[PDB]
């Protein structure tokens, strides 16, 4: 079934980035304001390269059906082929980052692990399709309700080549470097293993309860020196990672959860755990607790 542009009523801006913008809209064909509230993504500056990447993100999202992956709803073509709109489910609790920042320690360790398990499961399913998320962070995870989180924003997702286990980005855009694996920093190489490294960073964010002074950019900047600027930050971060500088164990975090983070943060790509293993391990910790 099709979505008519004339029936998409603007409600609120949700955000912007990666050459796109996301708005909360009511899909109201009955024109009585009883329509479903949806999330609508469109391109801000729509070049032929941007259209091509947007179409690929649409195909990727439409191919994914999992409880812990944001639902594709459709496409609106009313403005023509060159001005597509991606329609997705709207998750009113917003990002896990905002949700956790608000609700802090009132969300216990058992609950953080329920979210951790769901993130692993969504990521494992993503990996079976040979898709590399490339932007795993609490800011890119949505809360559906108290018991369910879902991976969102597939705007940076790459499909692995048929004959290779990594995707090489020739001309990188804005990069979340404090979530990046060393091979992604040095060679712009992305794989299931680099998504596992970013997952270790997600687990860290969770157990610091999004405390501002404890964030991966704040911790890494203190380790390299706050006087470092521009490309010198990347140069120093690479050398720090090479010499085993890592994020600290968050205050009150169980030893066992810190060990999972440190295994994800292995410089050897082949030694990092698998998402299938992580979900099994995290479910065992949950059960024990
Ligand atoms: C608005 C913003 C910067 N970007 C996007 N949101 C949604 C999106 C899809 N459904 C949503 N429902 C609620 C909210 Cl707050 C956002 C969305 N889908 C794609 C995006 F690029 C965002 O919130 N990102 C967090 C993420 F969704 F990725 F987890």
CA–centroid distance, residue 9 to ligand 1 (Å): 18
Helices (H) and strands (E) in the chain, counts: 9, 11
Pick from 120, 5, 122, 121: nearest CA to 70: 122
Resolution in A: 2.0
- Copy the structure tokens of residue 37: 């509230």
Best mutation site among 12, 14, 58, 72 for ligand 1, i.e. most ligand atoms within 8 A of its Cβ?
A: 14
Q: What are phi and psi of 38, to 5 degrees?
A: -125, 165
Distance, CA of 267 to CA of 183 (rounded, Å): 8
Residue of 11, 15, 122 to mutate, ligand 1, most atoms within 8 A of C-beta: 15
CATH architecture of the domain covering 91-287: Orthogonal Bundle (1.10)
Inter-CA distances, 227 with 39, 121, 207, Å: 40, 40, 28
Find out if CATH 3.40.50.2020 is the number for domain 1-90.
no
* Residue 19 near residue 45 (C-beta atoms within 8 A): yes
Q: Which two three-digit tokens encode residue 50?
A: 């941007």
Domain ranges, ordered by start, for the chain: 1-90, 91-287
* Residue 285 to residue 257: CA distance in whole angstroms: 8
Dmax over Cα atoms in the chain, in whole Å? 62
- What approach was used to elucidate this structure? X-ray
Alpha-carbon gap, residue 124 to 26, rounded angstroms: 33
**Exposure of 135 in the CB half-sphere (CA atoms within 13 A):** 17
- Give me the phi and psi of 112, to 5 degrees please: -60, -35
- The DSSP secondary structure of 193-223, one letter per residue, reads HHHHHHHHHHHHHHHTTT-GGGSHHHHHHHH
């Amino acid at each position: 079934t099709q979505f008519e542009e004339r029936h998409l009523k603007f409600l609120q801006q949700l955000g912007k980035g990666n050459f796109g913008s996301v708005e909360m809209c009511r899909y109201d064909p009955l024109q009585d304001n009883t329509g479903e509230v949806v999330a609508v993504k469109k391109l801000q500056h729509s070049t032929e390269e941007h259209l091509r990447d947007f179409e690929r993100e649409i195909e990727i999202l439409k191919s994914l059906q999992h409880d812990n992956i944001v639902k594709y709803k459709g496409v609106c073509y009313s403005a023509g082929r060159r001005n597509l709109k991606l329609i997705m489910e709207y998750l009113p609790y917003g990002s896990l980052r905002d949700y956790l920042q608000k609700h802090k320690e009132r969300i216990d360790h058992i609950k953080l692990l329920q979210y951790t398990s769901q993130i692993c499961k969504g990521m494992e399913y993503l990996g079976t399709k040979r898709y590399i998320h490339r932007d795993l962070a609490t800011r890119n995870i949505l809360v559906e309700n108290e018991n369910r989180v879902k991976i969102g924003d597939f705007g940076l997702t790459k499909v692995l080549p048929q004959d290779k286990e990594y995707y090489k980005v020739k001309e990188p855009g804005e990069s979340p470097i404090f979530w990046y694996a060393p091979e992604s920093l040095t060679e712009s190489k992305f794989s299931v293993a680099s998504d596992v490294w970013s997952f270790g960073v997600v687990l860290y964010e969770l157990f610091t309860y999004i405390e501002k002074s404890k964030s991966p950019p704040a911790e890494f900047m203190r380790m390299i020196g706050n006087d470092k600027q521009g490309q010198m930050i990347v140069f120093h971060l690479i050398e720090l990672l090479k010499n085993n500088g890592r994020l600290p164990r968050p205050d009150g975090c169980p030893d066992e959860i810190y060990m999972i983070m440190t295994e994800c943060w292995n410089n050897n790509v082949n030694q990092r755990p698998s998402f299938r293993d992580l979900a099994l391990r995290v479910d065992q910790i949950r059960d024990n607790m």
